[PDB]
Structure 1
Amino acid sequence: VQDAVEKIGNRFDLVLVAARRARQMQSGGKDALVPEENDKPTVIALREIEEGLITKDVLDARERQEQQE
């Protein structure tokens, strides 16, 4: 999780973001932004954070867009 903490900066904020994204994927039904490769939502969310597509700001903006829609 070194890449994830490098991209985020704080371990606790990284845990919060990853947990929120994993809950969205498991319950809401959002599709994975990265290839699954037979991985659980936790590892998928961590990989998405490491790549740089999922952050707190991105999640907040996406939620705002959904609420507007």
Structure 2
Amino acid sequence: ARVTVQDAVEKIGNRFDLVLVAARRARQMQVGGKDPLVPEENDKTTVIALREIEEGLINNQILDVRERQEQQEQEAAEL
């Protein structure tokens, strides 16, 4: 969170993928125009993403499902 990253690497298990699951995650509010799922708490998005992980709703896999289903709502939408 604001001070440490222990309680999120208890979930992720690595000191670099917690950066990498949030390097992927924390662009969607800078230029992606989206909103988080937790209470915002006036936070900069490099910890808003860290909040979403350490609230147990995000690992690397569950990010990969919302990025798949976005593409199959543009694929037949053209046709």
RMSD: 0.9
TM-score, reference length from structure 2: 0.82
Task: Determine the structure 1 residue equivalent to 2:10.
Answer: 6
Query: Which of 16, 20, 26 does residue 16 from structure 1 map onto?
Result: 20
Cα displacement string for residues 19-68 of structure 1 (whole angstroms, at most 9, x for unaligned residues): 11111121111211101111000111101100011221111111001011
Task: Determine the structure 2 residue equivalent to 1:49.
Answer: 53
Task: Determine the structure 1 residue equivalent to 2:64.
Answer: 60
Name which one, 1 or 2, has greater alpha-carbon Rg: 2
Structure 1: runs of 5 or more not aligned: none
Alpha-carbon shift at residue 11 of structure 1 (Å)? 1.4
Between Structure 1 and Structure 2, the one with more helix by share is 1
Q: How many equivalent residue pairs?
A: 69
Distance 1:36 1:19 in 2: 18
Distance 1:54 1:33 in 2: 11
TM-score, reference length from structure 1: 0.92
Q: Which runs of 4+ in 1 moved over 3 A?
A: none
Percent identity for Structure 1 against Structure 2: 88
